[model samples]
Target: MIAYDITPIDLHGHLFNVSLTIEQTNDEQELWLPNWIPGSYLIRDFSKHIIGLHAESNGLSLPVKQISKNRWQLARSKHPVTVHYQVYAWDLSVRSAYLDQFQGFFNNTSLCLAVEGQTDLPCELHLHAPPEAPLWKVATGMPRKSGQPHSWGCFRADNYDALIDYPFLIGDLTIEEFIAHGIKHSLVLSGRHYADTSRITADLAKICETQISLFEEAPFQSYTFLTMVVGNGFGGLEHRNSTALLCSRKDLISAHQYEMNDNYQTFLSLCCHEYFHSWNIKTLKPKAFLPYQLEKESYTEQLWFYEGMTSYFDDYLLHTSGIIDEKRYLKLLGDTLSRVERGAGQYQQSVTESSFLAWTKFYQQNENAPNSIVSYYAKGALIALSLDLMLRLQSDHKLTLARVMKELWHEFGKTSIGTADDTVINWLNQYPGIDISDFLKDALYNKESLSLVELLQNFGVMVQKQVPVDDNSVGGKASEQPARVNFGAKYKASPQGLDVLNVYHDESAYHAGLSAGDKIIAIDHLQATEQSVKRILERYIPGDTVTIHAFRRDELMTLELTWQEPAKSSYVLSVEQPDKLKGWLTP
Candidate 1:
């Protein structure tokens, strides 16, 4: 068995002390700090956070050689040798460790080093609170010995994978507990907030039970939501039995407020998204990620299945549980469609390519990202939605997406088999009158526009593409029709005026040599702000020559730009057949 100990030795100093003892066997052995955590797609090289790493045995310091950035080689010894290190924990995100006077949280991936050859062994981890933290409490999903209080800080995992799956939250938490389907669930909020536990607990209970019913039952005996509320934060990472979440402090509704706002709904949607992963990716993962490669990228073209399917269920589940109405859900769906269509990257890259390039481009996005890349998460959800609708309609509403997912769960999730890339598609082909080969090809492998509108119409949801009114004309007059025009560039509000962020490929802006980072000081000699840029363009129509004066770094230049009509923002779905829509929306 592998043994490890960790403690927040200094609270204000933001340092964690970690110790690992392994029985020495060979002439030399190596240890590695995880280069990246699971769920998060990038290689963060967690070793960069460590300081003062050394090894010792029997009161004598042993020789420790730095083999690689994250690997250390220790001279072999007959007896067990202990490796000690300190990690700087100042990152305040959901991925890794953070520490301060008020709160502390971490994942084992950011705290523990693996015993290179002994990772398969069972593990024991002991934690210690700093002397300064008297009121601090501990929360994790790890198993502990009977009679040992959870606050005692000692935990056990069956294996290394299990060890990292349970992240630690050490702080004064507003813990709320509830039982759903006989399984205990804990919600621990670690931050300063006057959250309304009454409403939150009741809402979460319904969402939990709704998801549990979908999966037939809870897969795990218990679960946890280790949430960190901050001034401005929003993220979540799923684990086997729990999820780590981050949200804005104001997103939580206080006791005095009963009206639900968009921020709170966003937080709830984030919760549902991560909770859905308790089954989707946490257990029913892609075959490519069967055994993760921590030191490098794990390639998979099927993130659209895991992430995309989960994304589809996240918000829709809210509707199923009566948290939001169908109209709200349709609005959310339209917003999603708008987000996917806004980027030119969707036309350049497919979801499959997006999933494979996630490590390089998707996760590491820049200004040109909109023009060069698509998002597997966003587009994948549409693919899932399309497939779901196709399956339902082709079967005359006898079959549903939930049934298909439950089949995948039992076939792969329970058996611990990594699902094949084409498992869902192949399975769907087994049914009569259903061959989604062409649809999958166009959605995943090619840049063909998705058939969402066509599929949604069959279910009585009318899909409409609303034309965008001329921004400049919409505000000025109620009489004449305003001429619509677009620069074909995305910009942000800047002190100088509208700062051009990206110029779409083959658009009018691109043709006029208007590049990113160029500030549009004026359009046709009128001062341009974010509002003015659109208002000034309303006076013109497509093919009108407008001279744009802009700053490219320190130089000012004038370019004659031919304006084009603005593309419609996105598609919206309205219910045409209430009964059919009810059949789809109801749990």
Candidate 2:
């Protein structure tokens, strides 16, 4: 167990008075969080977030000093040593410590000392919480004692690496567990009942099964799924054995039904997204991440493979894995296409740079965000899908894109930091004896759009424009969900400043015959901003009629449109796990 004898005491300004006993064994040890999480595909200064870090060991009140920088050296002579410290766990963002009246969340390094000084040492966490908050339940990706209470409940890290592989959440919450493929899946919530747990767990179980069937085996003997939700928050981070997600409980319960469908699809997409990270990012190697340098920037050009490909599968894997219907799947794909089609950033950002400069450019986004940036995940997924088709065509379907990844896993993933443009791509081409010169020369070298529609044509996929319906509610305008369409659609306070984009392009807009570029002026008497247009669409659904008023390059138009759901590509896969993906895993 990583934490033991957990006792809680409020320190300065309510900082957590945390303590743990370190037990050393007759072996070498070390601990790390990398400068980044694998699937996030970005260089991050996670260490900079640390504060109030202090440690002491042995009954002698031994002096503690910095050993090599982000690590502390403990003056030690034996096993079962005591190390204690208090952490100021304040920052409430997606990456680190979060504390609210409802729940608390923290990663090991964010709240505990890096035990590298004696990693072979067995460690036990003694968590102490506000006595009044005794009902709080804790969750993690590690192994914990089942149904233990008041302290005995803690998890074990396979090693130091495994120790940092998870984040812990504690709160007064509901707990539920179900089995799939003989593996346990657990759920805990702070303020609401997991009314959908029974079905959600089964879907997740199938997702896990689909994932195992893809790899051909289960990676961990057992694993757990943990969740924490605060209203209107949307972010998640992945681990080897578990994942953590933050979103609105209302989004799961009651939102406009039209929006709920999108929400539901988005919700499922997250599970599929994180699960794929287990293979692509957590354990899979990058061309440059062989031994990641956590102290500073770790650059890799293969994020296209690491993230872009994973982005493609995050949804396709679900459909292919049979989690969602084929129509829902393709509709999802069409929605993505329409999104990229209308988004303004498509012309300004490249998938490669988005992957390379993730910290500064991708993750660190702002109000004027859309005007300057593109998503590494979204663009990357398209790139991966195109590449997959290209690879299949080149190899006569003999060497699959998945197989190419496995081959890369063997070549660079096993012993190298990662592959470079020449190496990784070359290996892909050679392994299957294919010629990828056209894609490399045009897309990689010359910055040309790699005929995605042309490529998708091979697989019966496409990106198309959306038509909106005329809404009489707003005089002379079309109604549609409004979204920012260009590079970081963010704008300054000038007449042309960008605004927060819309999240959906529903049937109302499509019914009224509104297109992506149509500037909405009013929606049923409401002045139009991206938000107003969306609110109007949110009011009604397909088979329902709406009157929209808008302008297309200055032409006043009002069109009555009918609402209809788009096609999807949410799930996809070959019935039997392909022979190529065999031997890398086992169910």
Candidate 3:
């Protein structure tokens, strides 16, 4: 068996000064660092930020060679040894590394290495002292060292690659610890803005308490919330023991004013979403990520689970936890339904389709975001909701998404490997504690049209639709209809009038006379509602010269956006939402 013993010192949360103690008992070993982190779904090339790269074996430096991008080489040494490095942490967003004036964040991928071929080794982390900030602290998933301050976290992995996967953040931080049904929970955030520490901590405590009650277990020991509260910011990224979020301070005179969109409530939901990752994505990973390489995409069909299912619970956990009431929950659910109903991508962009093409498509958002593609986050969450409701209907609420997750965690998670989505569904059917074979066969794989409204109705909930009123000023009337405005990129808001942002290089919209900014007012004189917009251009089977109305800036214009029907999917998700589902469904 192989393992690594790591001691990471927080020079400052803004910098990663780490030391590695590796024991290579196996054959020829190659040690490397990964260029990407899972769940976030981006190849951030973490190696690009590494420094002080050297190797020494038992007081002697060993010969080494370069392999591929983000990999290194070293001659096999009889005795295991240690390596050290310093990593830069300047980019301050809600992701991999964040270094702001207030605090900093770092993950293993940015400051750790792998002992290639030594796949069965256990690992450990040692910390000296965090920043000297009077109220600052350090937080990470690495098991805490009794006297040393960090330990070999809860895994007996096969190699150094596995060891580096444990991404622990450091800095001056505060802990909000609470117990849920005998399960201990905490949120460890780093900031000088520790204004109302008690309230934020207590809120996190209650959230974990309730979610733990739902699953009947807490996955990590003494969890942490490693967040950086910049004056303005995004949310957090999920890890086993903790999360890194960018939010406003909790102490400012009007810190509570940050709750625009009830974000204060949503932040609590975001906390549950990341904490749940310990089970859904981190430990109970997609089998495809069994041996994650730092260089390439860990192509897994079940990313829908790692990301999709997690997206599903991010909000639900908060609602069920009582952080928000049923009205808030219904409002949230309605908003999600409205998004699905109004968007053009779902039908043309299936869940599986988005899952496969996530690399270039998911993160690459532009103007045409409304029309061109789909979302693993949005569609995946809906899929999870549908699947959970399906299970509830099939098993009478006694069995739930929680039950299936526990089974999956126990079976596939014992080993570090994750599974494909099909494997998960099939396993659910085979182990149907009762007899759920029919539901599995017909509903899941066959894509049976589900009446989500009916299923939700089982719990006495109804779905409603309200056309969100967008301020007419943002995407003011376009003057010309240049090529039907199909850039297919979605953004917060732009002047392109529900159009694609970036037209693909070889797509029909590009081939047509479409450019980046064009307004889609109507098709064949029908006002461009969400549905009509999708149908006018794509619904017709063949070489249909689609008539459209639109405008360029300050010019009332119309153009013929034409095309030979390209073989693309439009019927991604067939199930209807609450209001629509109740009205049209036969059963």
- TM-score per candidate: 0.93, 0.70, 0.71
Candidate 1 lDDT over residue span 1-587, tens digit each: 88888888888889999999886545688888888899999989999988999999878999999899999998879888999999999999889999998989999999998888788788899887677886688888888753234475568898888888889888888889998888899889998888998788888898999999988956788998899999999999999889999999898988998877778888889989998898898888887777777888888888988899988888889888988877778778877776687668898898988888889989898879878898888799888888888888777777788788887898888777978878877777776777788788788889756867767776778876643443222111122333367766777764569788777777778888888899888888888886666567667878788788888998998988987666655456678877667378642
Q: Model 2 residue 321 lDDT? A: 60
- Order the numbered candidates by TM-score, best leading: 1, 3, 2
Q: Output the lDDT of residue 475, model 2.
A: 14
Q: Model 2, residue 389: what's the lDDT? A: 75
Candidate 1 segments whose C-alpha is farther than 4 A from its true place = 146-150, 467-483, 494-496, 530-538
RMSD to truth, every model: 3.2, 9.5, 8.4
Candidate 3 residues 191-255, lDDT tens each? 55644556666667777776666556666666666666656666677666666667766422233
TM-score of 3: 0.71
Error of 1 at 254 (Å): 2.2
How accurate locally is residue 404 in candidate 1, as Cα lDDT from 0 to 100?
83
Lowest lDDT sum, 10 consecutive residues, model 2, at 485-494
Instruction: Name the candidate, 1 or 3, with the larger TM-score value.
Output: 1
Q: RMSD to the native, candidate 3? A: 8.4
Which rank order by lDDT, best down to worst? 1, 3, 2
